[PDB]
């Protein structure tokens, strides 16, 4: 019907693509039109060298070596906020919820702690002039006093752009953009292998405290219509059990703290761009007796933030309270500078003891993608639930009965989550619900390309082990290459190295 | 200040039986071991060794009634079983800041039936999941761990 | 205790708790010109045998691997054999009589009825006028406008084929004028029309759509292909294939399975070989239909790669930073770079012309996903015990670069020989099985495109969780879009009802915070906290109130498809129904417009 | 662009909603507490509640008929009888698929009517 013709500049192009034996598209079209199979594949295979083969290497309980973790100085903290070292100054006073302006809550929180002492530096940063970290805290205290003195709370404070706050915020500008012709003849224009770091105990302890129950209810999910379908009843059973076992977990505290902090940062950066705005670090939790509460972990001083592209980075200075002395695990605190804020009297076995109260100050940076990813931490609760539900549904498909009650309504079930110096410890459902949630929250907090390249490559080495444990005679074409692919991801990430160390433990105990 | 000299200094010439409380905070341990403390302190109801640099408690003498002990901020790593035999009537023990790392090191305290309050702040043992539950189920006689009870309610101040 | 969630697999199998090995629920917050150079260098390294030419139009060197020396080692090879590809396609047609004739018949009905507007239904596309990426609609509009600036106007007919004719004519113009007034030579326009950016230009996208449409029909007709299908339907394929192999009676044969990954899949597929099979599929067809399809492989074989932006330099001694574009990399001193980038520059310099690398031999990612699946399916077809002439035989599934193979042989040596005759035949057509991402195990447990099969139970985890939240249109849309997404992923992505319920809660907790629809019972104080309260007081059936007006949330799993208004209608107050819609409103898959439809 | 964040920021401020000029007479400028329901025209969302709270009423039942399929779905769900669940090994039905069929369970459900 139509007339789509190939003419010069497209016939000439078409005459140079076809294989290297024809000199025109018409010749090749005619050759293909007159093609009948004549056992070409068999002849080519016979001619092909026998070195081109896929030899199946048997996979036996002895083959799997433990993964080789990197070597070097111990890793260090990377999170935006302190995870298990956080100290909360709480109010326990509602204001009808929601309406309360954050800065007033920060003032009230700071008023509940008597014992402030003149700040002193305990752990120098070692890579920036330690002064101007002390002065930032002094300045924040001064402006807090100024706000208190004035009759009316401004409801949005803006720090004075002093010298110390400028240096801390990274205003040590990067070299100005210039023209390559201007700097054609200079010393060098070199455009950097990442340093390799080994495991440290702290990352394993931080995940132990992220699996523990707290005394406060951190997640208050909204209503759902009444349940009238049996499937709705089963779904409500699973969801309610998971929520009850998870609502008090510290992983949920991390979720809510991150959500609040990232929301505050994003709103402040999109609202007040030119000046440095003081953003309190606040999170609201309901206690064990139904009384609201408002916890102040610390302060965030935002920097100049004009963000058009997502990747544009805003630099802020985060100052978090804590009671964890830095001299216990110094290698963990390599990016923070530590000040001695005060003395807090806490109950010991013998009377009450005065323990120092520290502040961890770090100049961090975050873009808009790292704010939106961080306001969605509440979707970590929606992933652990699906993990638990997938296990339940798999073990219910193996059988032909709803195993929701055999999972949750059974005190005898115990999964091997943990390892003490006595054997694999087993915890009931509820430490598995909170353990998968901790894993999801830490995947969100410590997200990196290394983790995404280790989870994918370490899943293949896991299904082969499962096949061996199911007596399916696993075989691998190249197992040395798979180990290399796994190990190229273990470089310096504290989270990924831990997941590797977990893998070694599983292989040793699973195959033995 | 050495223990041998400082015990005499604290005594103020008072006889060992006449002292109810002896405080030896921030001392210089003799080779990391107690020295100068003997059984003559029969009535000693309060002994403190904060920031003493102690690394072993195997030199501790036998005291019949010592309800309060304060070993926090030392370098003790093990050998706690001695406390069970040398101090059969120990009630309040503080071990914050020591180098205890395994729950097994706390097993000997199970012998002490008078123990009711234990504190382990800044100890690496507190970095395990279910640390409170493990310690309580190991020492069922305890009621105030790290200053809090089993129900995470702060202890009254009368103790 | 020291919690260790990977030990969970000591009790539950790994195919049951596999969700724990997928880290993220969405796109992670991370991610240049250094990677493109490596891509082209590897593409030309895997095919450095026997022939280099010089294109007479663009004057760019081209490497022709096809019909090259046969591989003699296990490294990836792109020396596809034209004889073997044609033989494989011929056997594919033989085993499925009329597969290619029917596919062509059903594509001639789509090349004459495809509006040019279909080119706007896509993602970012390279724009040949501005020389930078622009959305599909903007790039198409710019191309049409510049074509109209010249004597090219057939695209006004409203048919994509006419736009293809216009671009074919434009390729002939001695000089092309663009105003926003610069005119480009013939060579320059070809280089700018046969260029792939860091994505192909608007000229190519017209033909590639038609080629993909033809491949889609073949893939649908192929039982072994599992690319076009998705979700639950794909779960019916995996088991199905395992049902074909294992099922047997009084059988001494043993069956093994291969979870497979194809290494450097895109860098070894060659457009010259794709032309060899588009020429076989389109046989005894109208010469106009064969011409339109071949143009996409013809351009792809001469494509050129744009080397992103470039490298950024900085010197601390004088504290100055600069950014040299990639166009000048052709003639730049190597003193400034480091050893690895220096080697990359040395290896890439001969190829590049006009600031773009001539990437002839390979194919960039994502362009021929479906057609590339026909080749793999053709190879999988060659194992039937009728084209094998031996005791062993194989069958399986393939989608793009991920395949699953099953081999049934009397002995272990029979299996090992069946695997070899598939790996080698794959090497003949340029398909390279990845030996560092594959494993073998007895049938009954394997993986395919993140669908994990274990003893007849298939777990689907290919797709990540969506974003359950306010879309951002208006009150009556978000509440009909979030609760529609939840339902859709419940039916498509198979997310368990417990997660659907908790997804409906994390959404309503967002719809109730952005719009300040915090309900009348709660004591939440805001700007809107006043009116809502009294709307609560003067109503009897409080269930009738919409969530937008502080009413109760009545959605559960059972009624996630019904719109909110029609759900609550039967229990709304007539005094409130009248006010709710009242067509004379000052304000006005979402529908059922009401007063809560602002803009 | 991130439409969700834009909606949040826009609902934060006053008078985000666009409106016709009819609102001048239809809705007052204030309420009992004296909060600006609109401004010269830009309209605050608080006006939408006012119209639904105390505004021009109506007694029309034409909606049950303009949207016939949706009310039919509501009726079939309200008059539909459920059945026992069955966990097993791996046009109304098309729409209630999210109930009737699952990954490893089947919900025996009849829509009725």
Residue numbers in the entry:
A (entry chain A): 202 to 392, 396 to 716
B (entry chain D): 1 to 159
C (entry chain B): 1 to 31, 35 to 183, 209 to 226, 243 to 632, 655 to 665
D (entry chain C): 41 to 80, 89 to 138, 226 to 248
Quote from the publication.
Replication of avian IAVs in mammalian cells is hindered by species-specific variation in acidic nuclear phosphoprotein 32 (ANP32) proteins, which are essential for viral RNA genome replication. All experiments presented in this study were carried out with H5N1 Tky05 FluPolA with the PB1 K577E and PA Q556R amino acid changes.
We determined the structure of a monomeric FluPolA in complex with ANP32B at a final resolution of 3.1 Å. The ANP32BLRR domain (amino acids 1–149) makes extensive contacts with the large CTD of PA (PA-C). The PA 550 loop (residues 550–560)38 forms a β-hairpin that inserts between the ANP32BLRR and the resolved N-terminal section of the ANP32BLCAR (residues 150–159), with the hydrophobic residues A553 and V554 contacting the concave face of the ANP32BLRR. PA R551 forms a salt bridge with ANP32B D159, while PA R559 interacts with ANP32B D119 and D146, in addition to π-stacking with F121. PA R556 forms two salt bridges, with ANP32B E154 and D157, confirming its role in strengthening the interaction with ANP32B. ANP32B interacts with the PA subunit of FluPolA in the monomeric form, at the site used for its docking onto the C-terminal domain of host RNA polymerase II during viral transcription. Comparison of the ANP32B and RNAP II CTD binding sites suggests that their binding is mutually exclusive. FluPolA pull-down is dependent on ANP32B concentration, while absence of ANP32B signal on the gel confirms that it does not bind CTD peptides itself, i.e. CTD binding is mediated solely by FluPolA. These data suggest that ANP32B can outcompete RNAP II for binding to FluPolA, in a concentration-dependent manner. Altogether, our data suggest that newly synthesised, RNA-free FluPolA binds ANP32B as it enters the cell nucleus, and that this interaction prevents binding to the RNAP II CTD.
